[model samples]
Target: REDLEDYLHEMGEITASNVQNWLSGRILLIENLAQTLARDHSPETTQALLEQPLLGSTFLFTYLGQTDGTYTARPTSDLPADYDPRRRPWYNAATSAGQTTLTEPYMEPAIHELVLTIASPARQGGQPFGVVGGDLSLQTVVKIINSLDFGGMGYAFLVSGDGKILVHPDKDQVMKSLSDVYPRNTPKIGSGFSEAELHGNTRILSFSPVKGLSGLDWYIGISVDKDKAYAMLT
Candidate 1:
């Protein structure tokens, strides 16, 4: 867990810079909107602003105004009438935390891909204005988890704060709760290196909490097949 946290921290540093630059650009764009409108700039100019790409981001976006506010995506599109970006987890998490924050992993509706959001609130005159955010793909994290191996048969998975499984080698269990796969009587949270019966096979389970992500009680663990784990002793 320490190693993973360190790696993620390093990655966050790189990603944070990209977020800062994107946020700055979005702020400037909003400040110039009035000037752009007065000059009667082509819609393309506005579109370009909305579509500007940010390094390390799958997509960059901002939600302007309040409930009735509009959202601008990198490749702008006509959002649903009732769509409210302010209600998004990323926006709420960042605003409530009053700083940059990472959102819980979720399946993105548009592309149905697993993703997480990193967001920061945009302010004006010390007051809340809007939110600036970037969508981060979870594929890299998933790949790393999949690459881990222990004693040949042992494998790892990631669980969210609320016990939701964020990364699992088995795709079917990716978004399901840990309890869904492992019965309640099996093992509770924080029970490091406990023995459990999973799918009728006895296994050794170890878990540790992830750092840096607030409200996301992320835990990464490895399940070792008991038979193989001690095979060398035999």
Candidate 2:
């Protein structure tokens, strides 16, 4: 989990153009998913769309007979009509606080641990549809992160905006931010937050703005382990 966090963090620092490309790819995929759903409007089409590596396990929900305002994951396949994160508060403060937010964790019951991003259509659009979301298993992404080579114990992983372990080498150890770990003295840059010393561990972090197809600003983070980041390149 932490294997590639540092690599991504370094990528965030040195690969602005690459990051932009990644963002562009996400936007394009989001549009494609939206347009496909708009046209077919059926479970088959949605299932096909979700098969894509980027959108696996995702489901689209519109208000019953209304399809407006905003849409979100119910976490439960047996979600009741009144399902709302705000009404049933949980660990993620943003949703609990009703921040109109996207979360990295699978909060609702029965949903495997996953990351979800949701968005509403452009205000100028005709239907004025609510939020459309895409889901990816965090386990899959963590695997991708772990695939990167950091040279020795140097590793990479992700942390949440609130400083929790969005992804770490050890899944069980992952949790929210550590004030002592990520000190205030760390540098700040661009749209994402940057800091060193997260959760009392020696690490460097870089964050960037993530925009979906609907043009909503989101977050992408990369981190590096200063302690094990040492290298002896031949």
Maximum-TM-score candidate: 1
lDDT of 2: 0.45
Models 1 onward score TM values of 0.66, 0.52
lDDT of 1: 0.57
**Per-residue CA lDDT of candidate 2, range 1-234, in tens?**
444444555555443334334435554555565555666545454455445544543333221111432233323267566755333322132223222234455543445454544332321235533234444446644554445454554444555445555655566645545453444774443344454665577766556543332222323455656666544334
Worst 10 residues of 2 by lDDT: 61-70
Global lDDT scores for all candidate models: 0.57, 0.45
Where is model 2 more than 4 Å wrong at Cα?
A: 1-27, 36-102, 118-126, 160-165, 172-175, 180-228
Q: How displaced is residue 90 in candidate 1, in Å?
A: 2.3
